[PDB]
From Swiss-Prot:
This is Obelin. It comes from Obelia longissima. It holds the Pfam family EF-hand_5. InterPro entries: Centrin_CML-like (IPR050145), EF-hand-dom_pair (IPR011992), EF_Hand_1_Ca_BS (IPR018247), EF_hand_dom (IPR002048). Disulfide bonds: none annotated. Ca(2+) 2 binds at residues 115, 117, 119, 121, 126.
């Protein structure tokens, strides 16, 4: 539950994502661009149903409003990153006490989409879909390794807690055990 906001790697990690989501390349991000790239495009790649897609959009809107984003508001990287620092810090207090968080809520919405065979758990077969998120579809070996990093109790399947912990580790805390989650194309 400790952050590493001054690590050049955490800064670069978010700059990479900011640049990617910045559809028109102008160095300013809007909630509009974020919803298009982080919600519409992602749900399409995952073959989410309309209901799952709309739920995911609600979670993305809430999450990024938590970072200071809004429709029509162009925000530069330093302000965007400060939004992330503030949200991570406030959410980590809640996470520590099993209280509701925007990041877990987003995790819930994505988990439902990955959990296709309808089971409440994600198995290795289903985890393949995670590779569709980033631009580099993982090797089979890397798919297994990222699954292993998530599967903390080695049960052979993931629950929402396990997936969310890795997502939070990647984006909030720069958790070394979450490194590699998205492959080498996402630093
Ligand atoms: O990674 C996901 C999907 C997800 C998986 C697990 C989970 O618990 C919650 C969500 N979404 C996501 N989660 C986070 C961010 C993200 C992270 C940092 C940032 O500055 C902006 C967006 N973006 C995205 C979309 C995306 C697009 C392209 C490549 C990777 C991811
Ligand atoms: Ca832009
Ligand atoms: Ca399942
Ligand atoms: Ca498990």
């Amino acid at each position: 539950l400790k952050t590493d906001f001054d690590n050049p790697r955490w800064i670069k990690r978010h700059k990479h994502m900011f640049d990617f989501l910045d559809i028109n390349g102008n160095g300013k991000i809007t909630l509009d661009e974020i919803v298009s790239k982080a919600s519409d495009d992602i749900c399409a790649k995952l073959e989410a149903t309309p209901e799952q897609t709309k739920r995911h959009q609600v979670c993305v809107e809430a999450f990024f409003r938590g970072c200071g984003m809004e429709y029509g508001k162009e925000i530069a990287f330093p302000q965007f990153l400060d939004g992330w620092k503030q949200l991570a810090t406030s959410e980590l207090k809640k996470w520590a006490r099993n209280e509701p968080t925007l990041i877990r809520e987003w995790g819930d919405a994505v988990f439902d989409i990955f959990d296709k065979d309808g089971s409440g758990t994600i198995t290795l077969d289903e985890w393949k879909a995670f590779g569709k998120i980033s631009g580099i579809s993982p090797s089979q070996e890397d798919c297994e390794a990222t699954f292993r990093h998530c599967d903390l109790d080695n049960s052979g399947d993931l629950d929402v807690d396990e997936m969310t912990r890795q997502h939070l580790g990647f984006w909030y805390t720069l958790d070394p055990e979450a490194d590699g989650l998205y492959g080498n194309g996402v630093p």
